[PDB]
Design a protein around this ligand. Structure first.
Ligand SMILES: O=C1N=C(NCc2cccs2)S/C1=C\c1ccc2ncccc2c1
Length: 266
């Protein structure tokens, strides 16, 4: 209730810092307006799809933000989420530090891949993978995926709706308003990896997306450029599977998260 959490300041769009009074566990308190909800689901009881998806993934593995509880109110739902502390999102981290060293981008990108695999494996498609939806636990060197608000149940048939981020959306979406979950996710991941290693996204305009040429603006190793170009293949079915990505040579010898924090974060 109002009395089971103390409640601090806004964190962003919706979303306050809080301390669970049972044990002052740090938490994040997210408010979503019923009028602003696109997709709904049920439990055993009508809820935002977001809550369905979160319950399906909120099961131990720390690559995804865990939903600890939720409430319904007259015109909103309120979601109690886990909150690491100290923390920073990948968009701010990149904005400050600039392009990441390959070693660090490798550790981060690997952790993202583990977390997306987990979602898919729990039957959930995120649909908005990007720097702003990735939190860094700066002490442990661990990344967490957030914001399942554009997500969907994973399926093998074609999606004809998207409401994620356009500049991370694939060309098939842009030209046909059709995509398949996995292959579009792989594309978003190619966008994200370019961002990590170049300090910014590679395409701003629809036509750049559709054209698919990748220009590297920073020094990036040949293997990393190849992986990126691969994830950004124009034909969906020419993109790598999660497994091919993780067996790519650029992905070998990844640091553990703790090592990652000691070398690059502390
Ligand atoms: O799930 C999340 N969605 C976020 N932003 C978009 C919206 C907010 C309200 C309606 S739509 S932020 C977020 C989760 C989250 C979880 C833990 C955090 N800890 C520290 C800082 C930010 C955090 C955000």
């Amino acid at each position: 209730l109002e009395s089971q959490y103390q409640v601090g300041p806004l964190l962003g769009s919706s979303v306050y810092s809080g301390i669970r009074v049972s044990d002052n566990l740090p938490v994040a308190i997210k408010h979503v307006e019923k009028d602003r909800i696109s997709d709904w689901g049920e439990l055993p009881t009508r809820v935002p799809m977001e809550v369905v998806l979160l319950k399906k993934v909120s099961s131990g593995f720390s690559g995804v933000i865990r939903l600890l509880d939720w409430f319904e109110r007259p015109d909103s739902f309120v979601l109690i989420l886990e909150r690491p502390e100290p923390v920073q999102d990948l968009f701010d981290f990149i904005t400050e530090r600039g392009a990441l060293q390959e070693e660090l981008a490798r550790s981060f990108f690997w952790q993202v891949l583990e977390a997306v695999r987990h979602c898919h494996n729990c039957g959930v498609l995120h649909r908005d993978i990007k720097d702003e939806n990735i939190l860094i636990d700066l002490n442990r060197g661990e990344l967490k995926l957030i914001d399942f608000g554009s997500g969907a149940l994973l399926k093998d048939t074609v999606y004809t709706d998207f409401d994620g981020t356009r500049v991370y959306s694939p060309p098939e979406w842009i030209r046909y308003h059709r995509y398949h979950g996995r292959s579009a996710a792989v594309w978003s991941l190619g966008i994200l990896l370019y961002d990590m290693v170049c300090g910014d996204i590679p395409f701003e305009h629809d036509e750049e997306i559709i054209r698919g040429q990748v220009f590297f603006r920073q020094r990036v190793s040949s293997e990393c450029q190849h992986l990126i170009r691969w994830c950004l293949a124009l034909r969906p079915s020419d993109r790598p599977t999660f497994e091919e990505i993780q067996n790519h040579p650029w992905m070998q010898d990844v640091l553990l998260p703790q090592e990652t924090a000691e070398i690059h974060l502390h």
